[PDB]
Symmetry: C2
Subunit: 103 residues, 2 copies
């Protein structure tokens, strides 16, 4: 219920930070890169997490302004985002020295 | 702040479920197996997560009753815990088909 929900948000949040770490991207680029990974994540799911990560200053954005379409948010992983990402990746790595003790 | 906190709880929660998946254990066994993994996690950190995972029926416990010491909680990963754990491990695995698209 609550634990499952937060942990699943966490996985998706980590995945967003992962995808943004090399290239900045529109939400639509993120959705598309997920599609290539055989993952469907809709706007209803993706948008609030982007907002949550921006609010904690892990992501930041600038508006891309046009005359042809609406303003689009162009997201990048911040300094704080890159450091926290580095922490998490090393923690998954440690979680395989754990996977030795479990088995 | 908030995102960092929930994501770190998530990592530890996953680690607890990982450690409990083969063997049931006292909190002290979990702390000890973490010590062997070069990880220090104190009671103040571990206890509320165990409680949180039990409350979502991912863990369950029975009291070990003695005349020599106090009652001790003996924890195991539930059916629901094992299934959710299986979901998460496969999701980390998928997160390496993601790690190809990131690079
Ligand atoms: O607000 C416009 C939104 O749609 C655009 O297609 C972009 O993918 C996204 O970054 C932005 O949030
Ligand atoms: O309540 C007693 C507590 O301490 C014991 O040492 C056990 O490690 C733990 O499972 C239990 O929660």
């Amino acid at each position: 219920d609550n634990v499952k929900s937060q942990m699943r948000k966490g996985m998706l949040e980590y995945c967003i930070m992962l995808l943004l770490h090399k290239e900045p991207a529109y939400a639509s680029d993120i959705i598309q890169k997920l599609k290539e990974a055989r993952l469907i994540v809709v706007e209803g799911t993706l948008y609030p997490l982007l907002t949550r990560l921006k609010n904690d200053d892990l992501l930041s954005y600038e508006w891309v302004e046009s005359t042809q379409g609406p303003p689009r948010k162009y997201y990048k992983l911040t300094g704080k985002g890159e450091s926290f990402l580095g922490e998490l990746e090393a923690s998954w790595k440690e979680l395989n020295e754990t996977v030795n003790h479990i088995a």
